[PDB]
Amino acid sequence: TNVYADSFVIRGDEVRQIAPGQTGKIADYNYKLPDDFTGCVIAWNSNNL
């Protein structure tokens, strides 16, 4: 019906905390996902740029 494309840039170690069911700092203070599924998660290394 719709597509939500959310975008940001975070650490390479903290990239694991973008998930429903994970704890830490990123998950607990900045961003989180509910007790449901998301479409997909994508993350590419772009420190070169």
Add this chain to the structure above:
Amino acid sequence: LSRLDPPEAEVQIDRLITGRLQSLQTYVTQQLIRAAEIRASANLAATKM
């Protein structure tokens, strides 16, 4: 419920739930059988009266 997170508490609560449901169902079925027997005995007693 006290010392665990909903994403994990789901599975433990589900295990307890399915076990208690099986126990309640067993109880209900055995009560049905015993009540059928009691009905037959009360029919005998009504005819004897």
Add this chain to the structure above:
Amino acid sequence: LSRLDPPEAEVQIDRLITGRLQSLQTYVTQQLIRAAEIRASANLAATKM
């Protein structure tokens, strides 16, 4: 089945399957009990005839 992968479709289908099997079994047992009662009533009616 349309929007998931066999390695996890196995799990979800297993959940649905065990649930539906429990429901069908409950139905069959209750029908057995009710048919036993109907048999007793038809025996009463046979002897009354």
